[PDB]
């Protein structure tokens, strides 16, 4: 049924990736995946006959309260890290390690400094991200883990570590791409940005970046496209960057929703009144998506090395008519996008948004575990569909 018209001028190279973090969390509260014939399968295993190369996976320093109860939202720490990067180099595929610094989500809005950092003066603070980012690295190595790019923070747009300050937030990105670099000449190091929609933003960046003399490979930016504008212009300002600062460009994040339906009870991301859908919600819709915003960094040019689909995977629970039961599995294993242990934390906006997954009308898999042939864009956008 489905349909991929290919991609014009795709390098045979470029990066097909999927950050499934919230696996390890999804595991232990019972979820299970399948492949196209309907047996329990690795679900690592069956990204990689997808087509898909890479696999990327946040890392947040405590995601814990005082007692050890995760914060949810996979409760992706170092050790989780390992877990799925042994798997994800276990299937032949490259390991793209997102450090939040910070002890959970880390984005626009937060980039709170972790607990561990929360009143050290800037100086130890960065000697503390190296030494972190360095020990981790490390520990990934000793694994056999076959690390191909390192994310020195996650959509640090106003912010990092509880830094706001450029001036600071640029010694931050080199204090970890520092460690990177003293770990393998050959990873990556990957700046992660969003909201390539504003006027002017990634060009301030790019310049701001540059001016401070911060060390980086890639500009790495987040492309939803119910927010982020439209695909001309993201291939616009990251090929800015690309032409002008001679880095290397990518999307570390995308999706698209493939059904209008909530499948565990706790309301999703989307799809939503006033978010720009320009594909119909179903599958080949959510498969158009994706083929597209790869088309879109692959029109970059030799600059455009991939794309990263996030979250593919977040299925729920269990069904929707089982909310209750669902939020004591959420609680429990963090498989959820976040618990009320977190409230401390963030009281904010985990405070009181705590629960389930709010991306599983967003997965490549259904509600029940079974591949969605949109999951098969992966391989198609270099052929297309006969
Ligand atoms: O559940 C329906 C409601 O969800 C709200 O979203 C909450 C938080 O405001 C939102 O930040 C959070 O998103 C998580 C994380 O913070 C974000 O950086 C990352 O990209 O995604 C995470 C979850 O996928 O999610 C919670 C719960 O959804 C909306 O604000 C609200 O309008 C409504 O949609
Ligand atoms: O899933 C989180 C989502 O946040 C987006 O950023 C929004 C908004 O679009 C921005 O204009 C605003 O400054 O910050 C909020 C988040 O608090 C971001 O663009 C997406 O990529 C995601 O990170
Ligand atoms: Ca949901």
Same mark, same amino acid.
């Given at each position: ?11 045979? *190279? ?24 309907? @047996?329990?399968? *690795? ?50 595929? +490259? ?19 972790? @607990? ?6 800037? !100086? *130890?603070? +960065? ?54 670099? !003293? ?13 390539? !929609? ?59 929703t493939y059904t209008a339906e909530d499948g565990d009870g706790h309301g999703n991301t989307a799809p ?38 996030? !979250? ?14 669902? +939020? ?23 405070? +009181? ?12 898999? *259904? ?20």
């Amino acid at each position: 049924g489905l349909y991929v018209e290919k991609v014009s001028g795709l390098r045979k *190279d470029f990066i097909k990736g999927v950050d499934v973090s919230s696996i390890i969390a999804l595991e232990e509260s019972g979820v299970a995946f399948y492949n196209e014939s309907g @047996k329990k399968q *690795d679900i690592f295993k069956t990204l990689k006959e997808a087509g898909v190369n890479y696999v990327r996976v946040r890392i947040w320093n405590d995601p814990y309260d005082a007692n050890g109860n995760g914060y949810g939202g996979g409760n992706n720490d170092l050790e989780k890290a390992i877990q799925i990067g042994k798997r994800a180099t276990a299937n032949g595929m +490259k390991l793209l390690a997102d450090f939040h610094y910070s002890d959970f989500w880390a984005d626009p809005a937060k980039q709170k400094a972790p @607990k561990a950092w929360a009143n050290l003066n800037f !100086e *130890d603070k +960065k000697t503390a991200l190296y030494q972190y980012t360095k020990q981790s690295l490390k520990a990934m190595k000793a694994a056999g883990i076959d690390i191909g790019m390192v994310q020195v923070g996650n959509e640090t747009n106003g912010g990092l570590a509880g830094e706001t300050d450029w001036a600071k937030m640029s010694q931050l990105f080199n204090a970890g791409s520092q460690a990177v670099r !003293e770990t393998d000449s050959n990873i990556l190091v990957a700046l992660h940005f969003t909201n390539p !929609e504003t006027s002017g933003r990634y060009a301030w960046i790019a310049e701001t970046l540059h001016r401070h003399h911060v060390d980086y490979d890639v500009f790495a930016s987040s492309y939803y496209p119910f927010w982020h504008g439209t695909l001309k212009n993201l291939t616009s300002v990251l090929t800015s960057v690309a032409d002008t600062y001679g880095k290397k460009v990518m999307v570390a994040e995308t999706s698209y929703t493939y059904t209008a339906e909530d499948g565990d009870g706790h309301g999703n991301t989307a799809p939503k009144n006033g978010q720009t859908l320009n594909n119909p919600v179903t599958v080949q819709g959510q498969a158009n998506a994706v083929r597209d915003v790869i088309q879109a960094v692959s029109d970059v040019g030799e600059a455009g090395i991939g794309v990263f689909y996030w !979250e593919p995977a977040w299925i729920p629970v269990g069904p929707a008519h089982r909310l209750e039961k669902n +939020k004591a599995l959420w609680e429990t294993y963090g498989s959820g996008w976040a618990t009320s242990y977190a409230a401390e934390y963030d009281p904010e906006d985990a405070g +009181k948004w705590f629960g389930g997954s709010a991306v599983d009308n967003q997965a490549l898999f *259904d509600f029940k575990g079974r591949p969605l042939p949109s999951l098969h864009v992966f391989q198609y956008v270099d052929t297309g569909t006969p």
